[PDB]
Amino acid sequence: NLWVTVYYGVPVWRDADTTLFCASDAKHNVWATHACVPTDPNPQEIHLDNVTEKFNMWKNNMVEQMHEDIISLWDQSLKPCVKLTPLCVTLHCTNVTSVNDREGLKNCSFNMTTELRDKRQKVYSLFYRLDIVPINENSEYRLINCNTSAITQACPKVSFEPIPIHYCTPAGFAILKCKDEGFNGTGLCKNVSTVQCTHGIKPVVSTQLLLNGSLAEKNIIIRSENITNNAKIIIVQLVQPVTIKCIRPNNNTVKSIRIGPGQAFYYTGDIIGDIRQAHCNVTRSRWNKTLQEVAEKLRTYFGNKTIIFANSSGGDLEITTHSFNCGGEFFYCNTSGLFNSTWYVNSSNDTITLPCRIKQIINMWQRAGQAMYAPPIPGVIKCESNITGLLLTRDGGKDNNVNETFRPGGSDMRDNWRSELYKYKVVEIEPLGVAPTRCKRRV
Amino acid sequence: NLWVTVYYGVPVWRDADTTLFCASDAKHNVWATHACVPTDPNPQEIHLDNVTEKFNMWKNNMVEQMHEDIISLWDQSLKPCVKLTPLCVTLHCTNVTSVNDREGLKNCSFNMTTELRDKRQKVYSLFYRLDIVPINENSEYRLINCNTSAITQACPKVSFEPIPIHYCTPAGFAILKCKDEGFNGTGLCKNVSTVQCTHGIKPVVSTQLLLNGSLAEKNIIIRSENITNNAKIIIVQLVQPVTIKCIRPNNNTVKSIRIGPGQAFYYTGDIIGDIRQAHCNVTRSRWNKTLQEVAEKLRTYFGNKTIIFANSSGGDLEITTHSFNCGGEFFYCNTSGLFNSTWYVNSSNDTITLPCRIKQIINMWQRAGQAMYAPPIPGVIKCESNITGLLLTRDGGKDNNVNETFRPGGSDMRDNWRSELYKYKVVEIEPLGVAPTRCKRRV
Amino acid sequence: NLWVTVYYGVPVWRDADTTLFCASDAKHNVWATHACVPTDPNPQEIHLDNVTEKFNMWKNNMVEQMHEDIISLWDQSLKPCVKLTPLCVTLHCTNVTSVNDREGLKNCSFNMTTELRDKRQKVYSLFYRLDIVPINENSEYRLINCNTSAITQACPKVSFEPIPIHYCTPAGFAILKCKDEGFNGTGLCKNVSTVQCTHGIKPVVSTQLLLNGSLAEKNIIIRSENITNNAKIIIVQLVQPVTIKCIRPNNNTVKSIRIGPGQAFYYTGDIIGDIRQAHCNVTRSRWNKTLQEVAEKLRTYFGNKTIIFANSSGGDLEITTHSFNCGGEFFYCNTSGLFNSTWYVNSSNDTITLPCRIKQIINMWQRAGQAMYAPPIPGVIKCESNITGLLLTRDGGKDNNVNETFRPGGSDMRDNWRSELYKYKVVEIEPLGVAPTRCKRRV
Amino acid sequence: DIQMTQSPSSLSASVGDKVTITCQASQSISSWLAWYQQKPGKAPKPLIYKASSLESGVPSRFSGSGSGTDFTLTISSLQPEDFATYYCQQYNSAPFSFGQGTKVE
Amino acid sequence: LGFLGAAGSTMGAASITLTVQARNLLTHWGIKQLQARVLAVEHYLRDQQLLGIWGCSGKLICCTNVPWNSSWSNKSLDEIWNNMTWLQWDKEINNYTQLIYRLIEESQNQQEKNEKELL
Amino acid sequence: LGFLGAAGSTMGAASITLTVQARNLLTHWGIKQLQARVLAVEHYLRDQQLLGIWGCSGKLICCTNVPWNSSWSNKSLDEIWNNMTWLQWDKEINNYTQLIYRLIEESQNQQEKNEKELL
Amino acid sequence: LGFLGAAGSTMGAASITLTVQARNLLTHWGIKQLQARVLAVEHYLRDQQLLGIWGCSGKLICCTNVPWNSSWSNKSLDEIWNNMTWLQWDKEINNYTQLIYRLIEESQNQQEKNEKELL
Amino acid sequence: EVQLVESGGGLAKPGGSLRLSCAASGFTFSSYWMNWVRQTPGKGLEWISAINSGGGSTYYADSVKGRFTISRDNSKNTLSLQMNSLRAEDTAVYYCAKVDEDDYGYYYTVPGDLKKYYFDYWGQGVLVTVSS
Ligand SMILES: *[C@@H]1O[C@H](CO)[C@@H](O[C@@H]2O[C@H](CO)[C@@H](O[C@@H]3O[C@H](CO[C@H]4O[C@H](CO)[C@@H](O)[C@H](O)[C@@H]4O)[C@@H](O)[C@H](O)[C@@H]3O)[C@H](O)[C@H]2NC(C)=O)[C@H](O)[C@H]1NC(C)=O
Ligand SMILES: *[C@@H]1O[C@H](CO)[C@@H](O[C@@H]2O[C@H](CO)[C@@H](O[C@@H]3O[C@H](CO)[C@@H](O)[C@H](O)[C@@H]3O)[C@H](O)[C@H]2NC(C)=O)[C@H](O)[C@H]1NC(C)=O
Ligand SMILES: *[C@@H]1O[C@H](CO)[C@@H](O[C@@H]2O[C@H](CO)[C@@H](O)[C@H](O)[C@H]2NC(C)=O)[C@H](O)[C@H]1NC(C)=O
């Protein structure tokens, strides 16, 4: 006969949702590295065999917790320092000296309250045009975000460098890491390894182009929940990085004034040399070859179709322009110099110049109730990064035709981190199991 | 001889106090129902047989926890809302232009700070006379509670809907439900049942009258910790609810002014048509019969004297008048129209009019540390409720063998919540037990 | 052969670090001790025998945790109080009219706000010269610390009484208490006793000396992590207390002005009587004998040499003078009248008076900014305390001389509590233990 | 602007005789009015603090009353001195105008 | 039949439904929920430690070598298991339950030591 | 071998390393870590308490008196213990498993009562 | 004797009071107290799981099928149980404590598997 | 008592200018308002100017608006009045006066407004007259 028996510590899991916690190396960073628990010096990654796991990065909940944690950390990093509410004053601006772009910077003057509440001081500062809008459409001017939220100056001590962090799970749970060669967004992973914590993920905030992201192994892969649907973001991961460097030619000089008891305020005092706009360079041959490979990979999915690209759809800068974080300055600028070409089945010191603008007041998290005032960086600022991914978006072409139009755009920030957490899935351990055995309990 | 033995999972309990957690059905509510855990479809209420234990509704830590939780949620809801501290400005109030009750409303004009810090505007508004006090009787008026606390405007998106909430106990604790009929109050119960979570408790707030409460089983239940003592509040539960309805005929208009850099301020605009004070309607027949029945029930415990009833003694408007929460306005209606009838040992379109006055600057929890500025609700608001209980207090110290006096009016909102928690008691379950048995342990 | 066996509940321990908690006796105090768990009238104290434990107060984590706990308590205590940021205005100060420290006090007048933001008011108040600094460098002045951080007035309802607090350890850990006679800071303890919670540790706040502290049992105790190093603080404990009495002859009259909505600001209205300097008294015979005993005991560590005391090292007023908390008022007494004598190997009241100064604006933790405005205490205030410890600091040059100079300094806030937590240490008990024996389990 | 009117312009008196001086206001001034006395060749001095209040340093014999627009300075004239010109000035007003001036001897 | 359903039933019948009873033992609202959960865990561990320290771990019904003292109770055994209820029985044991627990602890320790010394 | 290293191995072979799986079961980041730790303790106790009342506390392998039925699974023990995996085993009996626990609890309680009556 | 009152006692004498220590294992101040409470619970389970996976659940004294290695300690049994305290032994076994635990769990699992196959 | 004197008066030509000075002592001159009045023969006293404690927000009567200027020196404890374009009917005995209540308390825009004052101390006025 057969009898019911139980087994403890059985090796079986089940998909579930749990709260994850950070893991960073050992106060001066916006991601709160010191406040987070120290990183495990040796994460034991146990390899598995004879097992296949069904992965789906378009439905995992860990990415949502990552987004919430990033937002909470950003808010926690902005509130403990200087606020900038008395800045909403009628600014009187005029044209700059125009030392060889004319509308790219304005010379403004306004009243401000010094440390003495009964004393008023007058200051002169330079603000970008994108940071100021007319107050009555005629002279006088007002900041861009003054009728929607309170301006809060960023903490000068902290840094916005995307330091990598590790995501761990509490006891009783595990994170399955897919290691299949060329694994797409969804499918059965035949090479799965169990790890307690995820690898070092850098919380980048770039849009329409992934910077310092993960790299492919052998070929360019495409991730999409529904490739047929044109309303889903088409994430593309490159195999070879494309070097990109940006530089602003303004030798900006910082000046500081104090308002109220403390609350040190920083602004742009003067510009040494000829004023100029920011720009970014990318290799011509490298980007052209990478774009050709991406077009070929897209053609493989569609089938004998000539892939063409456009210069996005059009709208607000934050949505239709590339965003940067490196150097403490948020570069919001054009991308038409890259997604402007055509392809077909048949097919040095040369770079592409992409003009760029500078913006200080930003609402990066698309929140109308919060804002941040980025202080100017003294002197000349340089930056360089590696392009590893792109955020394409197929247009709503109804007719089949011969060519398909693809436009860069993410429409949200959630898909940015989905390209890095594609190889992770949190599960819960079930050490209790039941199996029949010939043994029987005795008195 | 006998030896001691131990048992596990024993059915015994002890009276103790523990932290409770709320659970609701499937933010927009002031009670923050989104933070409570989802309640089960139905609790496994186990009816107990041959179980009798002492009950005391007047001595239970559950009501204290409920009161503290309600205050905590209220303060939590007002913390991220817009602050209205610059509104303390001198007002120049004049008589209203509309004809026909003109003394209860004033047309005031005052300066206000616009979005820009270096700019001011002029605004015209209508403010009630209750929340307006004179400055020097010159005329210059000032809002009430301006020299005692900083007023805070309530968030227009949130609502004060009295959605029911269920109070639950953690693992190891159970709630004894005294579903016995005729349960007057403290004493010994019977037909007790055990449930994990209590039923839907209405968090509605009212004074000297219970609305949307629990009805009695068959006979009117009167509760008092000491009915003979004149310093104790007496609660009465009716069997047949008395329908009550109040309206606000003033067709108020709502306008918005940018009070600060992003935040908005809502005030009352010009009223379309003639103005009329708010009032409530109660059926004379139902109220008369209910009053006769409660008079007989009250006369049963006391001597065969003459019950008289009377209006409120006086004092503050809050302790004298009755409150409401019809949508977004907090009414304060008179009470001389109900408790104005005597009864001996034996005993108009059937409607009693009840004058009411609207007030914006209010103190919901008799706390002078802060204040509420209820925004005006556009249009005409109507409400309907069921009268389920009445709070009565007896005055005097003489014998008065001819008649007895009783007056309505409670002391705090804590007593208000005792009407719903009269059949619940929290106990601690201990599964350990010792009993002697002829058992010899083996070697 | 021998076999291994596991033992549970074995009596061993290891050094570790945990989070303690308050256990004061049965909230409005500045330390909020009423919110913490109640004390135990019969503490769990078990004596030990034949046990030796290595103690080191200079390396324990209890003082570092207590410092952070006190800082957090102070910050959370001053958080709900009124902010004094609009008071940073220009003050037109004159003399005190010389009613007869006729120069220390200053009569200042300035502009101020009120309940209505439209109206303003002009009020006069008396302030100390130490809290006033010139702005024009020569009539008009400005407050000190106001140019660095905001000012926060302490709530007059709270009390700064140093009530004792008991530090307990959670379950699974124990506190080792040393009872050896004449036990210094380091060294192994022979008379060790285990206790669940610490004794009546009073979190007194003082510098350059110790007040209301513990005392030795048989002889003077000298503690230092490195007596040969002059940079280390030399904490000495007295065997008998030295009484000290202080008085503030200025009969203050507290007034009040309502600034902003609801909140108010307290200041000094007028001084009843003649202006007099606050001072302290101490017996010359008792202090002289105490100094002789301390010099005799300290002579052992430096051979048969002479001991000379100096009057601090000079510099800031907060690090070269005393600091009391008598009744909420802070006194800065001149210690030069005590540490002024010399001693050799060979060898009526007449009380010694110590002139003291008072500061309303203070930063006890010496942190950059975040100063607290102490409200004035109405009427005359007296104070009495016992001197139990001295914070000496070794000073020397070539060191090959026959005399040594000791200056009372230290300036470390952690040294205050380190003089009381020298008898405790936290350990982690490990109930799991293994040991060999001769036995085998059944199969 | 506002202007005061005082009457009688002049009247003879003696030691112990009972006389009276009053002034009227064209506009409402409630009770913001003070009286002054001025001897020939000497600067004027305050006499009445407020409508129903007496100025410090002035003997208790002097008194006054009035409210709204009519004010009367009660002078029993028992004292032999102070037989000078009395003025009725209305404060709480833009021009702080004075009275015409009444002399008694 | 139900959780805690045999509380007021007979003494003997209440000793069979112990298995179901042993199973059910395990911003502002979030912190209160966490506090209640931690308190529930502590409450379960408090009794589990005492049950496992007496040598009767994982046993619903267990007996030790400690003899029953007549000073604690003088009623007959038949009425205990046939005409008695746990509710009115726990009341009198509250005065000497700690002493009984201590005796069981000492008996368990000495018994286990003797058992180990046997080999 | 390692933690959870025999998940894909044969059920019979995976039963040889169950101790490695059972032993490894145990300002925003501060509260997050606190909640994660209490959740982990809760998850461990959820299975430890459930296994304790079955009479198999502290035993990795335990045999019960409840007889197996072909309705739940007609698979033979040969393929189950020779090439079948635990993951697929749990994937095949996802439902109607909770009743097995009830049968085990009732049988264990009845066995304990019978043992008490026998002694 | 009290809690932890036999630390300096003889090895053999300290084994008698093993129940006095095991029984005692269980705004800013509120969160600190909660953290300390959860830490204490985690500390208790840290050793409870180890004592339970070895088949010695609910037993103060347990025997394992693991022979003693002379490399760990060359001292005689008499010298261990009659000439030193527990504190003067943990400092010598702390080096190979983890290895001993691994051997105990592996031996216990193998013994349980063999016992199940035998029945 | 409070000492208050004034000087600087003398003969002048119509349409010219003249400056007057008032001295104060025995009290906090930087905490009380100052006023200037005239006494013409026959006609009663007429108020012509006022000044706050700070010095700004000067007040003048319609009969001398734009012609006279008032100023004070807090450091020197003196008050002055400037006469410009004086005419024949401007002759009178100009008296220097001081208010009774100080400027301490509630105010709207200047520490001395919102309060109703009255002249308390009157100095020995100087005579100013013009002729052909
Ligand atoms: C409260 O607020 C009041 C209203 O704002 C303040 O009154 C202001 O006081 C300041 C400081 O004195 C004045 O501003 C500066 O004053 C002097 C000029 O004064 C010199 O000249 C005048 C006569 O012309 C004389 O009285 C003085 O002694 C000096 O010789 C210079 O430093 C600057 O140019 C500047 O004007 C304001 O004029 C005055 N405001 C008004 C409306 O009168 C007051 O000081 C504040 N504090 C207190 C305690 O009351
Ligand atoms: C508190 O008392 C203890 C002893 O109960 C003192 O510890 C002793 O510290 C001295 C140095 O201050 C040590 O002497 C040194 O030891 C070694 C070996 O000789 C070497 O480094 C030096 O040559 C020197 O002799 C001494 O060994 C040490 N004793 C013990 C038992 O640890 C401690 O200094 C006293 N503290 C105070 C402030 O008095
Ligand atoms: C993916 O998105 C498409 C829309 O682009 C979904 O709708 C189908 O679209 C195809 C396009 O060839 C049509 O032939 C089908 O009739 C559409 N289905 C329906 C129900 O309208 C499609 O369902 C999505 N999913 C998949 C798996 O393709």
mmCIF file of N, CA, C and O in Angstrom, chain A residues 7-36:
data_model
loop_
_atom_site.group_PDB
_atom_site.id
_atom_site.type_symbol
_atom_site.label_atom_id
_atom_site.label_comp_id
_atom_site.label_asym_id
_atom_site.label_seq_id
_atom_site.Cartn_x
_atom_site.Cartn_y
_atom_site.Cartn_z
ATOM 1 N N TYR A 7 8.037 16.043 3.379
ATOM 2 C CA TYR A 7 9.467 16.289 3.250
ATOM 3 C C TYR A 7 9.738 17.760 3.525
ATOM 4 O O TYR A 7 9.103 18.634 2.928
ATOM 5 N N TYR A 8 10.678 18.030 4.423
ATOM 6 C CA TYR A 8 11.045 19.391 4.779
ATOM 7 C C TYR A 8 12.316 19.801 4.045
ATOM 8 O O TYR A 8 13.166 18.971 3.715
ATOM 9 N N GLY A 9 12.432 21.100 3.791
ATOM 10 C CA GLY A 9 13.584 21.630 3.083
ATOM 11 C C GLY A 9 13.652 21.159 1.648
ATOM 12 O O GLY A 9 14.749 20.975 1.108
ATOM 13 N N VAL A 10 12.500 20.958 1.018
ATOM 14 C CA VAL A 10 12.423 20.493 -0.363
ATOM 15 C C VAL A 10 12.796 21.651 -1.284
ATOM 16 O O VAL A 10 12.469 22.812 -0.989
ATOM 17 N N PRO A 11 13.517 21.402 -2.386
ATOM 18 C CA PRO A 11 13.913 22.495 -3.306
ATOM 19 C C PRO A 11 12.936 22.832 -4.436
ATOM 20 O O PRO A 11 13.102 22.457 -5.598
ATOM 21 N N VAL A 12 11.882 23.575 -4.098
ATOM 22 C CA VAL A 12 10.882 23.996 -5.072
ATOM 23 C C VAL A 12 10.486 25.431 -4.743
ATOM 24 O O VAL A 12 10.443 25.831 -3.575
ATOM 25 N N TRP A 13 10.214 26.217 -5.784
ATOM 26 C CA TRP A 13 9.845 27.615 -5.614
ATOM 27 C C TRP A 13 8.531 27.908 -6.326
ATOM 28 O O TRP A 13 7.958 27.056 -7.009
ATOM 29 N N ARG A 14 8.065 29.143 -6.154
ATOM 30 C CA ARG A 14 6.830 29.621 -6.758
ATOM 31 C C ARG A 14 6.937 31.131 -6.915
ATOM 32 O O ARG A 14 7.506 31.815 -6.060
ATOM 33 N N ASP A 15 6.393 31.643 -8.018
ATOM 34 C CA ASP A 15 6.434 33.077 -8.277
ATOM 35 C C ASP A 15 5.612 33.836 -7.243
ATOM 36 O O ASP A 15 4.492 33.442 -6.905
ATOM 37 N N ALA A 16 6.178 34.929 -6.738
ATOM 38 C CA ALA A 16 5.510 35.750 -5.736
ATOM 39 C C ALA A 16 6.114 37.146 -5.764
ATOM 40 O O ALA A 16 7.078 37.416 -6.483
ATOM 41 N N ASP A 17 5.527 38.033 -4.966
ATOM 42 C CA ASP A 17 5.964 39.419 -4.857
ATOM 43 C C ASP A 17 6.401 39.701 -3.427
ATOM 44 O O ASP A 17 5.723 39.299 -2.475
ATOM 45 N N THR A 18 7.530 40.391 -3.279
ATOM 46 C CA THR A 18 8.061 40.732 -1.968
ATOM 47 C C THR A 18 8.777 42.071 -2.046
ATOM 48 O O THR A 18 9.041 42.597 -3.130
ATOM 49 N N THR A 19 9.089 42.620 -0.876
ATOM 50 C CA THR A 19 9.773 43.903 -0.774
ATOM 51 C C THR A 19 11.279 43.684 -0.837
ATOM 52 O O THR A 19 11.835 42.923 -0.038
ATOM 53 N N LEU A 20 11.934 44.350 -1.782
ATOM 54 C CA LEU A 20 13.373 44.243 -1.955
ATOM 55 C C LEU A 20 14.078 45.392 -1.242
ATOM 56 O O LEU A 20 13.509 46.465 -1.028
ATOM 57 N N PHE A 21 15.337 45.158 -0.875
ATOM 58 C CA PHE A 21 16.138 46.166 -0.196
ATOM 59 C C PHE A 21 17.474 46.329 -0.911
ATOM 60 O O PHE A 21 17.984 45.396 -1.538
ATOM 61 N N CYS A 22 18.024 47.536 -0.809
ATOM 62 C CA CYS A 22 19.279 47.905 -1.447
ATOM 63 C C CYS A 22 20.467 47.147 -0.863
ATOM 64 O O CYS A 22 20.380 46.468 0.162
ATOM 65 N N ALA A 23 21.598 47.289 -1.556
ATOM 66 C CA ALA A 23 22.871 46.701 -1.146
ATOM 67 C C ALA A 23 23.935 47.544 -1.847
ATOM 68 O O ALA A 23 24.198 47.341 -3.035
ATOM 69 N N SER A 24 24.527 48.484 -1.115
ATOM 70 C CA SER A 24 25.534 49.371 -1.678
ATOM 71 C C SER A 24 26.757 49.435 -0.776
ATOM 72 O O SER A 24 26.679 49.209 0.433
ATOM 73 N N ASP A 25 27.893 49.754 -1.390
ATOM 74 C CA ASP A 25 29.148 49.864 -0.662
ATOM 75 C C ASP A 25 29.120 51.074 0.266
ATOM 76 O O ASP A 25 28.457 52.079 -0.004
ATOM 77 N N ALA A 26 29.848 50.965 1.373
ATOM 78 C CA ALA A 26 29.919 52.043 2.355
ATOM 79 C C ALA A 26 30.682 53.243 1.803
ATOM 80 O O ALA A 26 31.912 53.269 1.818
ATOM 81 N N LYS A 27 25.948 59.222 2.140
ATOM 82 C CA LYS A 27 25.740 60.493 2.820
ATOM 83 C C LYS A 27 25.968 61.662 1.870
ATOM 84 O O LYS A 27 25.279 62.680 1.946
ATOM 85 N N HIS A 28 26.942 61.509 0.972
ATOM 86 C CA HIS A 28 27.277 62.536 -0.005
ATOM 87 C C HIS A 28 26.766 62.189 -1.400
ATOM 88 O O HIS A 28 27.224 62.772 -2.388
ATOM 89 N N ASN A 29 25.830 61.248 -1.499
ATOM 90 C CA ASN A 29 25.268 60.827 -2.772
ATOM 91 C C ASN A 29 23.748 60.869 -2.679
ATOM 92 O O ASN A 29 23.179 60.665 -1.602
ATOM 93 N N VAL A 30 23.097 61.140 -3.813
ATOM 94 C CA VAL A 30 21.640 61.221 -3.849
ATOM 95 C C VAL A 30 20.970 59.865 -3.694
ATOM 96 O O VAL A 30 19.774 59.802 -3.391
ATOM 97 N N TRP A 31 21.701 58.770 -3.899
ATOM 98 C CA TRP A 31 21.101 57.447 -3.778
ATOM 99 C C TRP A 31 21.231 56.855 -2.379
ATOM 100 O O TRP A 31 20.849 55.697 -2.184
ATOM 101 N N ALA A 32 21.752 57.620 -1.418
ATOM 102 C CA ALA A 32 21.920 57.197 -0.025
ATOM 103 C C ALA A 32 22.699 55.886 0.085
ATOM 104 O O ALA A 32 22.187 54.856 0.528
ATOM 105 N N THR A 33 23.965 55.943 -0.333
ATOM 106 C CA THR A 33 24.813 54.757 -0.274
ATOM 107 C C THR A 33 25.170 54.398 1.163
ATOM 108 O O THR A 33 25.169 53.219 1.533
ATOM 109 N N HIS A 34 25.482 55.404 1.984
ATOM 110 C CA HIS A 34 25.844 55.144 3.375
ATOM 111 C C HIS A 34 24.643 54.670 4.184
ATOM 112 O O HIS A 34 24.782 53.823 5.074
ATOM 113 N N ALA A 35 23.455 55.205 3.890
ATOM 114 C CA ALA A 35 22.259 54.797 4.619
ATOM 115 C C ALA A 35 21.845 53.373 4.270
ATOM 116 O O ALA A 35 21.102 52.739 5.028
ATOM 117 N N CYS A 36 22.309 52.858 3.135
ATOM 118 C CA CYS A 36 21.962 51.508 2.721
ATOM 119 C C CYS A 36 22.908 50.492 3.359
ATOM 120 O O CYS A 36 24.043 50.809 3.722
#
